[PDB]
Amino acid sequence: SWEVGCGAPVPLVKCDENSPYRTITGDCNNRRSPALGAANRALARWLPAEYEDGLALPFGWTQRKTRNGFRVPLAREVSNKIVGYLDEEGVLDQNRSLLFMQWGQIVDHDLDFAPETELGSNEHSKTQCEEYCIQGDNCFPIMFPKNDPKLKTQGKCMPFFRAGFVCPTPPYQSLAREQINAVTSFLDASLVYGSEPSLASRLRNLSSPLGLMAVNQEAWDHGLAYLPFNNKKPSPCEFINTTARVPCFLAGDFRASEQILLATAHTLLLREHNRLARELKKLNPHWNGEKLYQEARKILGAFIQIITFRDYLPIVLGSEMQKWIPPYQGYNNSVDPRISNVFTFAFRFGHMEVPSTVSRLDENYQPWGPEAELPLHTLFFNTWRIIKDGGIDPLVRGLLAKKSKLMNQDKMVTSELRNKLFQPTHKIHGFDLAAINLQRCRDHGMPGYNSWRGFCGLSQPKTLKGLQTVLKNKILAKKLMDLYKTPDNIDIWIGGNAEPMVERGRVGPLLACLLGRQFQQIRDGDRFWWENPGVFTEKQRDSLQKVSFSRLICDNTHITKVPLHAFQANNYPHDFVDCSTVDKLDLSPWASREN
Numbered sequence: 001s002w003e004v005g006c007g008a009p010v011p012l013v014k015c016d017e018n019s020p021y022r023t024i025t026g027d028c029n030n031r032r033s034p035a036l037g038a039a040n041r042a043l044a045r046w047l048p049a050e051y052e053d054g055l056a057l058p059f060g061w062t063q064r065k066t067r068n069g070f071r072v073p074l075a076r077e078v079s080n081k082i083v084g085y086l087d088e089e090g091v092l093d094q095n096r097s098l099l100f101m102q103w104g105q106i107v108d109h110d111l112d113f114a115p116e117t118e119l120g121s122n123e124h125s126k127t128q129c130e131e132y133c134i135q136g137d138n139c140f141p142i143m144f145p146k147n148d149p150k151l152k153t154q155g156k157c158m159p160f161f162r163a164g165f166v167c168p169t170p171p172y173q174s175l176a177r178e179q180i181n182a183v184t185s186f187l188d189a190s191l192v193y194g195s196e197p198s199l200a201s202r203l204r205n206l207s208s209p210l211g212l213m214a215v216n217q218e219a220w221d222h223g224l225a226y227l228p229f230n231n232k233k234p235s236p237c238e239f240i241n242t243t244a245r246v247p248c249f250l251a252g253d254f255r256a257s258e259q260i261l262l263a264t265a266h267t268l269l270l271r272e273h274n275r276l277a278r279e280l281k282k283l284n285p286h287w288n289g290e291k292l293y294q295e296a297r298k299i300l301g302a303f304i305q306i307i308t309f310r311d312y313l314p315i316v317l318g319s320e321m322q323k324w325i326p327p328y329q330g331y332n333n334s335v336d337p338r339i340s341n342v343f344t345f346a347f348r349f350g351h352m353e354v355p356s357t358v359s360r361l362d363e364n365y366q367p368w369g370p371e372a373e374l375p376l377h378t379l380f381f382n383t384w385r386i387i388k389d390g391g392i393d394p395l396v397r398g399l400l401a402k403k404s405k406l407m408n409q410d411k412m413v414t415s416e417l418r419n420k421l422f423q424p425t426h427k428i429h430g431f432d433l434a435a436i437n438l439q440r441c442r443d444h445g446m447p448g449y450n451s452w453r454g455f456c457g458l459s460q461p462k463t464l465k466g467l468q469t470v471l472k473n474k475i476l477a478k479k480l481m482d483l484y485k486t487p488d489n490i491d492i493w494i495g496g497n498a499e500p501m502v503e504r505g506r507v508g509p510l511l512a513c514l515l516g517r518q519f520q521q522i523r524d525g526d527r528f529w530w531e532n533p534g535v536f537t538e539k540q541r542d543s544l545q546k547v548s549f550s551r552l553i554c555d556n557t558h559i560t561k562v563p564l565h566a567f568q569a570n571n572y573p574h575d576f577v578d579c580s581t582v583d584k585l586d587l588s589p590w591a592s593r594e595n
């Protein structure tokens with residue numbers, strides 16, 4: 001027997017089936033199996049889960065219990081000995097702009113979100129976890145090793161709560177624990193519109209019938225829109241500067257304000273929806289509000305797909321791209337489009353691409369004022385620097401003109417994220433994203449590094465010398481052996497990211513495999529993929545292949561000079577051209593005559 005029975009919180013709807021538009025939840029994409037790839041279902045498992053008790057407890061929960069005969073090393077200790085470095089000189093990617101990093105986070109937020117178990121506020125378990133580092137139920141603390149400076153300064157532990165899971169969330173249920181994906185698995189701009197009907201409707205402007213999204217009423221960026229403010233107090237974005245009291249932004253995805261460049265990207269997309277809707281009204285004065293919203297929505301979703309598959313993936317995957325993602329042959333209704341649990345850790349390669357500072361540049365692409373360059377840690381949940389300190393254009397220019405960090409085996413994750421991460425629930429700039437990622441691998445029941453190497457048809461090193469050869473690094477292999485004892489025990493997040501990069505790419509072979517298969521599936525298993533015959537007309541498709549990120553900047557900012565290939569490293573002024581040189585999106589193929 002399978003167990004396709006269980007499935008409790010879900011939002012079930014009736015499928016229209018002749019609708020030319022996606023649902024908000026992702027239901028009804030697959031006609032035979034309507035819940036496939038919908039939000040608020042379990043992440044898929046390409047391999048069976050690996051928990052300490054076979055069902056739900058993570059490896060490292062019970063100290064007595066080993067993994068393959070060895071204790072698993074503390075997440076924070078792996079972080080200290082392997083992931084950290086001091087010297088930011090020499091660490092930048094010479095042929096990837098900052099936007100390369102930032103597009104990755106957008107795509108990843110469209111595809112997956114496994115929220116923490118909540119149980120609501122008004123609980124003393126949030127105190128008990130934070131205050132006393134007491135493991136149990138959903139509290140699974142990251143303990144500091146001996147000689148950690150955070151011991152002196154912070155406490156015994158970083159609090160950490162286990163991820164939510166399907167059926168029930170309070171008393172559990174049986175078998176193997178399966179984490180939830182709270183967004184739609186399809187690349188569909190769910191991060192802009194929401195993955196739930198409640199939220200999607202709240203994001204819309206339903207006073208006017210122009211199919212527009214709601215915009216801020218308290219603040220303008222030289223007459224351009226800002227996202228609306230989120231309702232909710234306590235607001236993490238006002239906590240970081242109680243004098244400015246600028247709240248977080250409200251968007252289709254809950255993490256939109258996590259850092260300032262993510263909020264910036266979200267603002268561009270909202271702007272583009274409104275631009276598109278008002279252009280479509282011009283051409284089709286008879287279209288109602290709904291039709292404008294959906295039709296703009298459909299274009300925007302196609303834009304994300306195109307940028308992602310044409311410009312971004314080839315420069316992640318490099319020479320592996322063709323091997324995993326062959327040319328499109330049409331919609332395949334037998335393909336599983338769901339995001340897999342392991343993908344949500346594979347795609348965290350981006351954490352190693354984040355540099356330590358962010359810049360604001362002026363109209364000649366020069367430092368914008370005296371405090372132009374800011375440490376990244378001051379910009380988590382920071383909206384006041386947008387509203388009170390220049391709007392988005394200076395941040396957008398920095399995206400274009402500055403570089404991503406290069407993954408480096410000796411310099412993996414900046415300290416801005418490794419020691420000074422801010423979490424919305426808590427009050428300190430003191431968390432470790434690397435340690436959280438490792439702890440989360442265990443929370444989610446990840447098989448180890450060698451299981452995934454075998455999955456991908458790659459060799460499985462068993463010795464120090466085997467690991468040296470795969471990593472092509474003696475010192476890194478040895479530090480890994482001293483902590484983990486067997487390469488079978490190496491957590492997937494760090495194992496995958498430790499491999500040298502493939503030719504023309506920015507991930508290694510294991511990751512290229514994991515990423516590559518996932519992206520093949522969400523393309524092939526999507527009935528509304530933009531090239532799937534009948535989704536758009538030939539002439540609409542012809543118009544859509546001219547989109548570029550550069551054009552999106554030009555249309556939705558006051559920036560006049562942009563590069564043509566925004567993801568590669570570009571110098572000002574030589575690589576910068578005037579916006580009037582950049583191909584526009586021609587919307588005349590959306591004109592709808594009567595007679």
Ligand code: HEM
Binds near residue numbers: 343345347353440
């Ligand atoms: C300054 C930039 C960024 C910050 C501050 C940030 C922060 C975070 C945080 C706090 C989490 C939750 C971790 C957990 O509890 O397990 C997370 C998850 C994630 N991050 Fe990032 N990150 C950033 C950039 C990126 C980039 C560039 C990518 C990809 C290219 C990325 C991909 C992801 C993914 C896939 C997850 C898992 C989401 C899920 O399914 O729940 N991140 N990140």
Ligand SMILES: *[C@@H]1O[C@H](CO)[C@@H](O[C@@H]2O[C@H](CO)[C@@H](O)[C@H](O)[C@H]2NC(C)=O)[C@H](O)[C@H]1NC(C)=O
Binds near residue numbers: 207210212215217
């Ligand atoms: C919903 O859309 C309407 C119509 O576009 C917005 O109202 C206009 O917005 C500008 C800026 O606030 C004003 O100068 C006009 O007074 C408004 N025009 C009309 C015809 O009402 C409205 O702000 C939108 N609402 C939200 C929350 O975004």
Ligand SMILES: *[C@@H]1O[C@H](CO)[C@@H](O)[C@H](O)[C@H]1NC(C)=O
Binds near residue numbers: 095315568569
């Ligand atoms: C930068 O990357 C682009 C796009 O992947 C590539 O074609 C170009 O040759 C690269 N530049 C350098 C200097 O290697």
Ligand SMILES: *[C@@H]1O[C@H](CO)[C@@H](O)[C@H](O)[C@H]1NC(C)=O
Binds near residue numbers: 244384
């Ligand atoms: C708080 O914001 C105000 C402007 O609202 C600014 O002048 C001040 O620097 C900010 N303080 C901090 C500590 O970020």
Ligand SMILES: *[C@@H]1O[C@H](CO)[C@@H](O)[C@H](O)[C@H]1NC(C)=O
Binds near residue numbers: 332334
């Ligand atoms: C569609 O996908 C299935 C399962 O992944 C695969 O075996 C088959 O080759 C594909 N079928 C078609 C008709 O392309």
Ligand SMILES: [Ca+2]
Binds near residue numbers: 110183187188190
């Ligand atoms: Ca989605």
